Amino acid sequence: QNPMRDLKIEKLVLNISVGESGDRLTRASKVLEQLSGQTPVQSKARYTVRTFGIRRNEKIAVHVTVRGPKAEEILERGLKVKEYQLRDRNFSATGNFGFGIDEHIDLGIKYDPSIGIFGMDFYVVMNRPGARVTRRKRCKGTVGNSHKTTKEDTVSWFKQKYDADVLD
Amino acid sequence: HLSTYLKVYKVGDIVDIKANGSIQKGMPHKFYQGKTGVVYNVTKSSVGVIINKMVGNRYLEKRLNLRVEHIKHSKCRQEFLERVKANAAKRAEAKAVQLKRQPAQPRESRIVSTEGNVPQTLAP
Amino acid sequence: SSAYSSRFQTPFRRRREGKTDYYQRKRLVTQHKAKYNTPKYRLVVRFTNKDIICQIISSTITGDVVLAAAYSHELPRYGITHGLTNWAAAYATGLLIARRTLQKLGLDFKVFLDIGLQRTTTGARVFGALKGASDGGLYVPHSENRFPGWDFETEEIDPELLRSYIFGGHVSQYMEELADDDEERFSELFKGYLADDIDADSLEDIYTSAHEAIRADPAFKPTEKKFTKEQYAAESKKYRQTK
Amino acid sequence: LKALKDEKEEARQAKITMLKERREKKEENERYERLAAKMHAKKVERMRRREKRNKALKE
RNA sequence: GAGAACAGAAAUCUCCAGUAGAACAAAGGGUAAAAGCCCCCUUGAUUUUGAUUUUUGUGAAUACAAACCAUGAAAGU
RNA sequence: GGUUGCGGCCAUAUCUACCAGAAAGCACCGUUUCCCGUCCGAUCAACUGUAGUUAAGCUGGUAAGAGCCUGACCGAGUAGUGUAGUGGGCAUACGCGAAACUCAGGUGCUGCAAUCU
C-alpha cells in the first residue's frame, strides 16, 4: 500500500566536465543555459594534477540542476537517446540513477558548428515526501528504514514508467 | 553548563578555584587550583577573590579577579552553620547540655540474644 | 561500534532535538551579575503550522517560568477566525501579550526579544510581533532596518508600506489579483474567505476590531476545559502502552 | 572423597568452559571484523599509492 | 562506500555513513548551528581615570569605569 | 494521562532491529503576487489550512543486543603500606586499607505555562 509512500523524481543534475578552460567552458555554459532556461554554475578544479593538464582554480567544468516537470521532461528527451535501455548498474544503492550521453545534439538541439559538440552526464535523485526533516534547520532529523529509497524500488518504478528494460 | 552563570556571588561568600578546560579565557593561576578565597568586590564579567599566600613564613594577601566560569561555591561551612543553628535551638531549649562536639566515645554495655542466632563455631 | 559508542560524547537533549541554541541562550540569560537578582525577561515568539506562540519567560535553575503566555487561537474571540499564522495575526498576538503583561505589572517592562532559529529577514513575522509588543508599549531595543519595505539600496524606510502589511495589504491585493485572474486557486485557497465574502477595507476594519478588543480585555479569558483531567487521562491510558 | 571432589570440580569446570566459550565467540567475531577492516584499508592504500600526493604541503 | 559518456587510483556531479579521526602558525589539551570554511559590514590594534597577577626595573596578560567608534534586529560583544 | 512551547540535570536519555500510536496537537503536505533569497520557491521568505496523509518525522514498548549508570559479606580484610624486635634465612605483633576484573540490577527524572476526549 502506498497512499503517500510514492517515489517521485526530485531533481536532475546535468554536468559537463571539460578537458580545458576558456571559451570551450563558456560554450558548454551556453549549451546547458539554453537547455534549462536558467543560468548554470561553473565548477573549478580542487587541486592540480598535471596529467589531465589542469591546475588549481581553473574553472574546468559547468553544470546545472533542474527540479519540477522540466526535470522529467528533459529526462525523457535524453533517455530517448539511450532508447529506454539502462543497465543493472547505473542505479545506486540509496535509490538514485544516472547516465551519460555523447553528442548532445541527439535531443532537439542542432549541430551548429559555431560552437562544436559536448557530451554530458545526467544524474537523477529520487525520494518521497518527508525528506524535509534532514534538510531544514529547526527540528532536524532522519528518515526511517521502511521509507528509505532503494535500488529495487527504483528499478521497479523504472520497469514501470518509461516502460524500460534492465539489460543484464 | 548554563547553571554556572545563574550563580549570585555576594561580597563575603567563600569559593574554591577550579578552572575548567572548556573556556580559554581567564585560565588562572597554575597552582591556584583547589584553593579557597572569599570575594571582596564584583563587577560584570568578573568576581573578586582574595587568598592568603605564604612566602617565607608569613601569610601575605593576594587579591585577584576571575571569570565566574572557574569559581565554585564552597561547602566548607555547611556543618558549621548547621551546628550554629542547632546550637541556637538547643540553647533556647536549655533556657526553657554539651552542644559542643565530642569524638567517638566508647560504646556502652548491652545484651546479645540467642533466639535463632546460635553462635557458629569454626576453625582454619 | 563499541569503541566509537564509548568514546562518543552526547550533546544536551534539547540540542539533540533541533530546538535550542545554547550559544545564544547564554548571551541572553547571563546577567551583568554585579546587580544580583534583577531577573532578565525575554519575549519568546515561535511559529508552528496553524498556530503562533508568544510568551514572556524568566529563567532560573528550576529551569524556567512563564508569567505571561498567549497564542493565536484566542483571536477568534477578539474577532478573527481566519489567517492565524499571518503577519498581522502575529502582530495582534504581540500587542495582546504586551498589553497583558503591562496590565499585570500595572504600569499602563523591559524585555529582550528571542528570535529562536528563524532567519533574520526583512519583513519577518517575528519582527511583526516585535512591532505589536512595542505598540503595546514595552520597550524592546530594535532598529527600523528589518521591517518590510526597507529599500535595500539605501538606509530608509516607508511607514505606509508596513502599515499596509499590518492591515493585511499583501494578502488583500493577492486576493484581488487571483480573483480577477482566476477562480480555481481562489476557491481552493480562500474557501472560508469565499463563504464569508470579506473586503479589503473590511479586513482592515476587522483588524482594527480585534486591536480595540485586545486593548479592551487582554486579561486572558481562559478556555472552558470540558471533560476534566481524569477523563482525558483514562482515555489516553487506554492507548498508552505499559511494560 | 573421590566421589565428592570430582562433582565439585566438574561443576566448576562447567562454569570455566562456559566463560571460555563466551569470550572466544566474542573475540572471534571481533577479530573477523578487524581483519576485514585491515584488508579494506590495505586495498585502499594500495590504490592511493598511485596518487603522487606529497602529504605535506597543501595539494 | 555505492553511482554517472569520453573519465582511469586522482579531473566534475549526486546520495549514505562519518564526535572530529580535519583545520585552527605533524604522535598532546580545547573548539562542531564552532574557537573551523564561505559570505556581509568595519578596522576597539582608539583616547582619559584608576585596580590586580606574572613580576625591586619595566614589559606581558588581566579585569574595571567615561568618551569617540564598529557590529547585529537584539541580547550583548 | 497525551501533546506543544521554553528550560534544568546532561546516554538510566545514546546506537542498532522490529512493532504500536482513538482523540488532541505537532509534522509531512498545497501555492508563489508581494518581503526575501536561491544556478535550482530543494533550504530560507511569504500565503491559505484549503487538495490530502499518519507513509515519514515525533511519541511509547520490545531485544538472555551494543554501550551508559548504580550497587555488591565481588575481588578482599587480598595487593600495597607506616611502626617494633638480638624474630627466620619472609612470617609474627599493633594498625591503615584499594583498584581492575567478575557478578547482579536498571535504560531518563524533572520545573513553568497552555491545550486535548
Which residues make beta-bridge pairs with B53? B60
Distances (CA, A) of A123 to A68, A117, B110, B113: 15, 20, 90, 88
Q: What are phi and psi of B91, to 5 degrees?
A: -70, -40
**Residue A40 in grid coordinates:** 548554470
- CA–C1' gap, B55 and E57, in angstroms: 22
Q: Distance between CA A153 and CA A5 in Å, rounded? A: 11
By CB atoms closer than 10 A (0-12, 13-18, 19+), residue B38 is: middle
Q: Distance between CA C109 and CA C138 in Å, rounded? A: 5
**Residue B45 in grid coordinates:** 564579567
Q: Which of C114, C117, C119, C121 to mutate to test the interface with A (most CBs of A within 10 A)?
A: C117
Which residues make beta-bridge pairs with C140? none
**Residue C75 in grid coordinates:** 483571536
Distances (CA, A) of D22 to A89, C158, D11, D16: 42, 77, 17, 10
Q: What are phi and psi of A23, to 5 degrees?
A: -65, -25
Chains that touch B (3 or more CB pairs under 8 A): C
Q: Distance between CA C92 and CA B1 in Å, rounded? A: 37
Which helix (H) or strand (E) segment is A31 a member of?
A: helix A23-36
A:D CB pairs within 8 Å: 3
- Assess whether C172 (CB) lies less than 7 A from strand F: no
CA count, 13 A, side-chain hemisphere, C58 = 15
**Residue C146 in grid coordinates:** 528589518
Considering only residues 71-100 of protein chain C, which place a Cβ less than 7 A from any atom of strand F? Answer: 71, 82-87
> At a CB cut-off of 8 Å and minimum separation 6, what does A53 contact?
A19, A20
- CA–C1' gap, A48 and E20, in angstroms: 27
- Resolution value (Å, 1 decimal): 3.0
Q: Which of A133, A138, A139, A140 to mutate to test the interface with C (most CBs of C within 10 A)?
A: A138
Helix runs in chain C, H state only: 2-7, 13-16, 22-29, 75-78, 87-105, 125-136, 159-167, 169-181, 184-189, 191-196, 200-216, 229-237
- Assess whether C127 (CB) lies less than 7 A from strand F: no
Q: Distance between CA C188 and CA C191 in Å, rounded? A: 6
User: Pairing mode, if any, of strands C42-48 and C51-58?
Assistant: antiparallel
Q: How many residues does chain D have?
A: 59
CA nearest to C45, candidates C133, C136, C108: C133
- Give the CA angle between residues D39, D42, D48 to the nearest 5°: 145
> At a CB cut-off of 8 Å and minimum separation 6, what does A121 contact?
A14, A15, A16, A17, A98, A99, A100, A101
Q: Distance between CA D54 and CA C37 in Å, rounded? A: 60
**Residue C126 in grid coordinates:** 517575528
Distances (CA, A) of D13 to A110, C152, D4: 85, 84, 14
Written as one string, the DSSP assignment of D1-55 is -HHHHHHHHHHHHHHHHHHHHHHHHHHHHHHHHHHHHHHHHHHHHHHHTTS---S
**Residue C87 in grid coordinates:** 503577519
Considering only residues 73-132 of protein chain A, which place a Cβ less than 7 A from any atom of strand F? Answer: 128-132
CA count, 13 A, side-chain hemisphere, A7 = 19
Q: Distance between CA B40 and CA B9 in Å, rounded? A: 10
Inter-chain touch B68–C33, beta carbons under 8 Å? yes
Considering only residues 18-57 of protein chain A, which place a Cβ less than 7 A from any atom of strand F? Answer: 38-41
Residues of C with Cβ-Cβ distance to A138 under 8 angstroms = 18-19, 116-118
Amino acid at A17: S
Chain Cα centroid distance, residue B64? 21
Q: Distance between CA A14 and CA A23 in Å, rounded? A: 19
Amino acid at B61: E
- Give the CA angle between residues C156, C113, C87 to the nearest 5°: 60
Amino acid at C77: R
Helices vs strands, H then E, count in chain B: 1, 5
Q: Distance between CA C135 and CA A25 in Å, rounded? A: 56
D10 shares contact with chain A (CB less than 8 Å): no
3-state secondary structure of C156: coil
- Report yes or no: C46 and C116 within 8 Å, Cβ to Cβ: yes
The DSSP symbol for B100 reads S
Residues of A with Cβ-Cβ distance to C44 under 8 angstroms = none
Experimental method reported for this structure:
cryo-EM
The alpha carbons of chain A give a radius of gyration, in whole angstroms, of 18
